[PDB]
Amino acid sequence: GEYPTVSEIPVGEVRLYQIADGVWSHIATQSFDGAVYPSNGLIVRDGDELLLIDTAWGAKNTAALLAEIEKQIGLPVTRAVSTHFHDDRVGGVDVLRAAGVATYASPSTRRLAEVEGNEIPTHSLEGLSSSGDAVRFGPVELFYPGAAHSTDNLVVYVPSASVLYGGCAIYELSRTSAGNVADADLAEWPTSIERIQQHYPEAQFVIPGHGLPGGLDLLKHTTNVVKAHTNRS
Numbered sequence: 462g463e464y465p466t467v468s469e470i471p472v473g474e475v476r477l478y479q480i481a482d483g484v485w486s487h488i489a490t491q492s493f494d495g496a497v498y499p500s501n502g503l504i505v506r507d508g509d510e511l512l513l514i515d516t517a518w519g520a521k522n523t524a525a526l527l528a529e530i531e532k533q534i535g536l537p538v539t540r541a542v543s544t545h546f547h548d549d550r551v552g553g554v555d556v557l558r559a560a561g562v563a564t565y566a567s568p569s570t571r572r573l574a575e576v577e578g579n580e581i582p583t584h585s586l587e588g589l590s591s592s593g594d595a596v597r598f599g600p601v602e603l604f605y606p607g608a609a610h611s612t613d614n615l616v617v618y619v620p621s622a623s624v625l626y627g628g629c630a631i632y633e634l635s636r637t638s639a640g641n642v643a644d645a646d647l648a649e650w651p652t653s654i655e656r657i658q659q660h661y662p663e664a665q666f667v668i669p670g671h672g673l674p675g676g677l678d679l680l681k682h683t684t685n686v687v688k689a690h691t692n693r694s
C-alpha cells in the first residue's frame with residue numbers, strides 16, 4: 462500500500478495518487494485544534510480534460526492542487542464538483558473560479574454554503590434532490606444517497622474504473638469514532654449508506670473523505686461507527 466499519509470505531506474502541499482487509469486485521488490492536509498488531518502478528493506480524466514471532485518480544503522491548498530495537477534498530469538481542469546457545503550469541500554472554489562474552472566454543486570449544497578458564509582459553486586446540478594437520485598456528469602455518475610454526514614452530501618462513481626468516492630459520508634477504517642456530526646442526520650445515515658451499497662455493489666475501490674482507501678467494507682464500518690455514536694451514553 463503506497464497511499465500517502467500526513468507525514469509525507471507538509472501542510473500546504475498536495476499529493477496525487479493514481480487509483481486506476483484516468484483516475485486519481487488528491488490528498489492534502491489541514492490543521493484543526495492542534496492536530497493534522499488528511500483529506501481526499503478525486504480527479505477523473507474525461508478525454509483531454511479533467512473533472513475535479515472537491516477542493517483541497519482551502520485557498521492555498523487548492524492553488525497547490527492546481528499546480529500539482531498541471532505538473533504531474535498536464536491536462537486542464539475544466540469542471541469541479543463539490544460534494545457537500547462544508548469548508549473543506551467548497552473552500553477553494555473562489556480559487557478554482559479565478560483559474561477558469563467551472564464550479565458545480567447541487568442547489569441544496571449551494572444554499573447551505575451560502576447560509577454558512579462559505580464559498581459558493583457557480584453552477585447548480587439538477588436531478589439530485591431526492592434520495593436515490595443519480596445523474597451522469599461527464600465520466601462519472603453523481604448520486605445523492607440521502608442525508609448522512611450532511612443533508613446534501615453526494616457520492617461519485619467512476620464506472621470505467623469501478624471507483625466509488627464517498628466523501629465525508631464514508632469513514633476510513635482507522636476512524637473508530639464519529640467525526641464531526643454537527644450537521645449530520647444520524648437517523649438516516651445508515652439508510653443512506655445502504656442505498657450506496659445497493660447502487661454500487663460492483664465497486665472495487667472506495668475512497669473515504671479522509672484517509673485510506675479500501676473496498677465496500679468501509680460502508681458497514683461507517684454504519685457501525687454511526688450507530689454506536691447514535692447510542693452513546
Ligand SMILES: [C]N1C(C(F)(F)F)=NN2=[C@@]1([S])[O-]2
Nearest residue numbers: 547548549550629640641670
Ligand atoms: C473536516 N470537515 C469539515 C470542516 F469544515 F471542518 F473542514 N466539514 N466537514 C468535514 S468532514 O467536512
Ligand SMILES: *C1(C(F)(F)F)=NN=C([S])N1(*)[C]
Nearest residue numbers: 539540561562563564584
Ligand atoms: C464552462 C466551460 F466551458 F467549461 F468553461 N463554463 N461554464 C459552463 S456550463 N461550461 C461548460
Ligand SMILES: [Cl-]
Nearest residue numbers: 562563564583
Ligand atoms: Cl462557470
Ligand SMILES: [Zn+2]
Nearest residue numbers: 547610611629
Ligand atoms: Zn462536512
Ligand SMILES: [Zn+2]
Nearest residue numbers: 563564583584
Ligand atoms: Zn459556467
Ligand SMILES: [Zn+2]
Nearest residue numbers: 549629670671
Ligand atoms: Zn470531510
